[PDB]
Amino acid sequence: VRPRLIAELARRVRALREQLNRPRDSQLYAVDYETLTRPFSGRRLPVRAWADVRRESRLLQLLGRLPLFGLGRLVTRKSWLWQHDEPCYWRLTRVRPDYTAQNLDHGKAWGILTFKGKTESEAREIEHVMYHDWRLVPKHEEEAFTAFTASVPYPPLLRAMIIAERQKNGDTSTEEPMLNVQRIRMEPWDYPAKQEDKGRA
Amino acid sequence: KAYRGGHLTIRLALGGCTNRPFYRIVAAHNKCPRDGRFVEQLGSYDPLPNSHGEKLVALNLDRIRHWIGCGAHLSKPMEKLLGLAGFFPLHPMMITNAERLRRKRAREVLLASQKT
Amino acid sequence: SSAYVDSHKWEAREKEHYCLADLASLMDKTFERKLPVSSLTISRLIDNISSREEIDHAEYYLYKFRHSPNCWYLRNWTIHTWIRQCLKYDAQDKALYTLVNKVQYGIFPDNFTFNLLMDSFIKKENYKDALSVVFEVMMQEAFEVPSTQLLSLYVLFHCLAKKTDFSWEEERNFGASLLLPGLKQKNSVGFSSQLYGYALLGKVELQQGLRAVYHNMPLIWKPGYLDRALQVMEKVAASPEDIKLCREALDVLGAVLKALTKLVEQLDIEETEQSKLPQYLERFKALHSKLQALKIESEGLLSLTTQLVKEKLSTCEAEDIATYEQNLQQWHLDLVQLIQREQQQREQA
Amino acid sequence: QPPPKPVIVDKHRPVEPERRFLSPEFIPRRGRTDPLKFQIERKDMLERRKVLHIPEFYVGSILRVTTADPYASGKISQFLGICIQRSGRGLGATFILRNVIEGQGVEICFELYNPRVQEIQVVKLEKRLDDSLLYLRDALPEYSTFDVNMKPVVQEPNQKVPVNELKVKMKPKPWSKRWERPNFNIKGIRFDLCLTEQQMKEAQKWNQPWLEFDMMREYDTSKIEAAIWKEIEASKRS
Ligand SMILES: [Mg+2]
């Protein structure tokens, strides 16, 4: 068998150069509010977020106006609070801005979160930080804001199949068979996701 | 052919000449072509009626349950066929299509009553 | 309060005396090789500065540190070394510039240090600079401090000495800043200033909508600022003492002038504030009559009452200084560990 | 927002002050003639110096030159290159530049008082151990490979001249000038590698110590260079 070396050499060199001089956070997050197109990509923005990108600002721009980017300060998911009335927030624990940014308007930061007043015991990370959809809540109006408070039949064919099965078995079992649904954790769309799973250019 | 990632998916394969489709529900990878290779030929469907008028379809219940327990996603037309069968829940888009057709038919009958 | 203002310990405690040019060259090399650097270098630099252009070098290197791989630290004692180095050598233009573009430099003074700064402003007797600076403190959102009395003095004096009829930016800045000092729940002055701030915010909403209320200002989104004002006045009339000032007349003027004859953020079921204006004004007249039926002198000038605040001001200055000395000594305790931490590198070398 | 202003101040006292420097073409040649000729050509080149700046440089400095040529795109010609030597005296004084581009080595001889040259610029200012660097022809091309797009390396206004103490590798022996001899008194080349102990011992045959030990041939310059300083200051202030 003939081995090949230049292929692995090029793989190594490309990985090294990528990790070395990949485009920067702010560089690839920048947007021109007039044309609504990200530089380095030439892609247009979605119509639903055109207005948000025109009017509203970004999370790090909100956080740059207060010391230490406001550890423990009240920032809420505007999308969550428009999709539902209940309060939802982010117990931001760690923060790191990008040094190449001029206004320090980009970076990575996260901590514990809460959905519908349901806290979790893990400092898991944010979802969609770089959007123009972020709203900061002051230290006043905090407690009033953070205040918060069977089964289904089977399909007809499936239940008929089970009826015939247990009739062949010999037990009548007059009860209609059902499954559990309170166990099923049907989660809303907007429950966040992990960043390490999704890649980056 | 080892595909990058992908997943098992039961979907429709097309057979027969033009203007005579014959669908085949069959398990395969997400990345395979339409009539590409498969794993197990599960069931069939004919969208045209027979001499009696019936439209035929065959489903392999135990094997389909085995494949779902192993893990395989469903395509919208085949899961719609399953919902029509009743082994599977009915489709919300089908409900909406029926409701829209009924709204349109009521509107047309109203327009006809206005014209007459 | 010269004792509260000046302090010889800070200027005669732990001075380094390294070469300014050598520290400049070191920082330049480190920031040209763009590797991260500790705050010890900047601290020693600032402690060694004794000149105007040296403070300017510090400004440039602080900009570089903001744009350096690590800037979140921003140690309070380092920024206070900088603040002293600036204000003792009298660079008020530079101080104000940094403080206004904090996002460009990221200075974040604590309560006692900022109170020293504003006392120096009092001594030099300037008004517009202190006004802009208290707007920047409103941006900071730091008011759980004994400097709350100074902020109240400043705002209550400058809103009266303003002499500016129409200015939307400045009027929103006021209507937003007048709330935070009064949140300490102290007296008529406190909650009536809260009420007047609610009125100002409602006016700003009615005149330019709710967008600017929250876009570049951290505020709450409930459009019923007039409803909240009515609620406050109602609970006050129901309940203590109410030493009142005639800014209720300004509130009346605003309400009447607004009652006088694109993205939709408002909800459909909820009415339009334009159509609430009438019942707003009717309930406002109602609460006015209720208050005058229920304290109603309306002659005690609000800024004149802030000199009576100077007594408990001098009282709380005690624990203010105490906490300041605590912070100084604990800085000195935990900081010496970092000096030997830098010596660890030379020991390993 | 406006951008901040860069500021740097390093004030080590006995480093900043450098005193004077003369060009190698104001001084005349050993030959005999009336100093009136020198005075006239000097005042002419100074009346031209009032216009043209000729930024100070040395051999081994990288210079960029723009010249007005009658036939060219825009009738202007740009050229960047390493300075190999400064030759001639008076108005005819020239400097040589060299650069390898597209694998091929070009050299120019610029007259620094011609009017068709538009301006001079010092991208880098250095001094080599060898006063004349014509051995770069036989040297490897990578030593003379300098890019045109490189911007000027800004130097402090008053500092000593940087001298890069280095050595150079060379093409194999089939040369043109036979650089190994001692009459050239050059050191940048690496003949320890480029040739053998036997060949260097054979080359030291031509060693002539009486050249440098002799004392009647050299040319004392203090007098005439002082006079030149005087005349330069006079014509400048006038
Ligand atoms: Mg030859």
Curated annotation (Swiss-Prot), chain A:
<keyword id="KW-0225">Disease variant</keyword>
<comment type="subunit">
    <text>Component of the mitochondrial small ribosomal subunit (mt-SSU). Mature mammalian 55S mitochondrial ribosomes consist of a small (28S) and a large (39S) subunit. The 28S small subunit contains a 12S ribosomal RNA (12S mt-rRNA) and 30 different proteins. The 39S large subunit contains a 16S rRNA (16S mt-rRNA), a copy of mitochondrial valine transfer RNA (mt-tRNA(Val)), which plays an integral structural role, and 52 different proteins.</text>
</comment>
<keyword id="KW-0496">Mitochondrion</keyword>
<keyword id="KW-0687">Ribonucleoprotein</keyword>
<feature type="region of interest" description="Disordered">
    <location>
        <begin position="168"/>
        <end position="201"/>
    </location>
</feature>
<comment type="function">
    <text>Required for mitochondrial translation, plays a role in maintaining the stability of the small ribosomal subunit and the 12S rRNA that are required for mitoribosome formation.</text>
</comment>
<dbReference type="GO" id="GO:0005739">
    <property type="term" value="C:mitochondrion"/>
</dbReference>
<feature type="compositionally biased region" description="Basic and acidic residues">
    <location>
        <begin position="184"/>
        <end position="200"/>
    </location>
</feature>
<dbReference type="InterPro" id="IPR032053">
    <property type="entry name" value="Ribosomal_mS34"/>
</dbReference>
<keyword id="KW-0689">Ribosomal protein</keyword>
<dbReference type="Pfam" id="PF16053">
    <property type="entry name" value="MRP-S34"/>
</dbReference>
<dbReference type="GO" id="GO:0003735">
    <property type="term" value="F:structural constituent of ribosome"/>
</dbReference>
From Swiss-Prot, chain B:
<comment type="similarity">
    <text>Belongs to the bacterial ribosomal protein bS16 family.</text>
</comment>
<keyword id="KW-0496">Mitochondrion</keyword>
<keyword id="KW-1274">Primary mitochondrial disease</keyword>
<keyword id="KW-0597">Phosphoprotein</keyword>
<comment type="subunit">
    <text>Component of the mitochondrial small ribosomal subunit (mt-SSU). Mature mammalian 55S mitochondrial ribosomes consist of a small (28S) and a large (39S) subunit. The 28S small subunit contains a 12S ribosomal RNA (12S mt-rRNA) and 30 different proteins. The 39S large subunit contains a 16S rRNA (16S mt-rRNA), a copy of mitochondrial valine transfer RNA (mt-tRNA(Val)), which plays an integral structural role, and 52 different proteins. bS16m has a zinc binding site.</text>
</comment>
<keyword id="KW-0809">Transit peptide</keyword>
<keyword id="KW-0687">Ribonucleoprotein</keyword>
<dbReference type="GO" id="GO:0006412">
    <property type="term" value="P:translation"/>
</dbReference>
<protein>
    <recommendedName>
        <fullName>Small ribosomal subunit protein bS16m</fullName>
    </recommendedName>
</protein>
<dbReference type="GO" id="GO:0005763">
    <property type="term" value="C:mitochondrial small ribosomal subunit"/>
</dbReference>
<feature type="transit peptide" description="Mitochondrion">
    <location>
        <begin position="1"/>
        <end position="25"/>
    </location>
</feature>
<dbReference type="GO" id="GO:0003735">
    <property type="term" value="F:structural constituent of ribosome"/>
</dbReference>
UniProtKB/Swiss-Prot annotation, chain C:
<keyword id="KW-0699">rRNA-binding</keyword>
<protein>
    <recommendedName>
        <fullName>Small ribosomal subunit protein mS27</fullName>
    </recommendedName>
</protein>
<dbReference type="GO" id="GO:0005743">
    <property type="term" value="C:mitochondrial inner membrane"/>
</dbReference>
<keyword id="KW-0689">Ribosomal protein</keyword>
<dbReference type="GO" id="GO:0005730">
    <property type="term" value="C:nucleolus"/>
</dbReference>
<feature type="repeat" description="PPR 1">
    <location>
        <begin position="75"/>
        <end position="109"/>
    </location>
</feature>
<dbReference type="InterPro" id="IPR011990">
    <property type="entry name" value="TPR-like_helical_dom_sf"/>
</dbReference>
<dbReference type="GO" id="GO:0000049">
    <property type="term" value="F:tRNA binding"/>
</dbReference>
<feature type="repeat" description="PPR 2">
    <location>
        <begin position="110"/>
        <end position="145"/>
    </location>
</feature>
<dbReference type="GO" id="GO:0005763">
    <property type="term" value="C:mitochondrial small ribosomal subunit"/>
</dbReference>
<comment type="subunit">
    <text>Component of the mitochondrial small ribosomal subunit (mt-SSU). Mature mammalian 55S mitochondrial ribosomes consist of a small (28S) and a large (39S) subunit. The 28S small subunit contains a 12S ribosomal RNA (12S mt-rRNA) and 30 different proteins. The 39S large subunit contains a 16S rRNA (16S mt-rRNA), a copy of mitochondrial valine transfer RNA (mt-tRNA(Val)), which plays an integral structural role, and 52 different proteins. Interacts with NOA1. Interacts with MIEF1 upstream open reading frame protein. Interacts with METTL17.</text>
</comment>
<keyword id="KW-0677">Repeat</keyword>
Curated annotation (Swiss-Prot), chain D:
<dbReference type="GO" id="GO:0032543">
    <property type="term" value="P:mitochondrial translation"/>
</dbReference>
<protein>
    <recommendedName>
        <fullName>Large ribosomal subunit protein bL19m</fullName>
    </recommendedName>
</protein>
<dbReference type="GO" id="GO:0005762">
    <property type="term" value="C:mitochondrial large ribosomal subunit"/>
</dbReference>
<dbReference type="GO" id="GO:0005739">
    <property type="term" value="C:mitochondrion"/>
</dbReference>
<comment type="similarity">
    <text>Belongs to the bacterial ribosomal protein bL19 family.</text>
</comment>
<feature type="modified residue" description="Phosphoserine">
    <location>
        <position position="23"/>
    </location>
</feature>
<dbReference type="GO" id="GO:0005743">
    <property type="term" value="C:mitochondrial inner membrane"/>
</dbReference>
<dbReference type="GO" id="GO:0003735">
    <property type="term" value="F:structural constituent of ribosome"/>
</dbReference>
<keyword id="KW-0687">Ribonucleoprotein</keyword>
<keyword id="KW-0496">Mitochondrion</keyword>
<keyword id="KW-0809">Transit peptide</keyword>
<keyword id="KW-0597">Phosphoprotein</keyword>
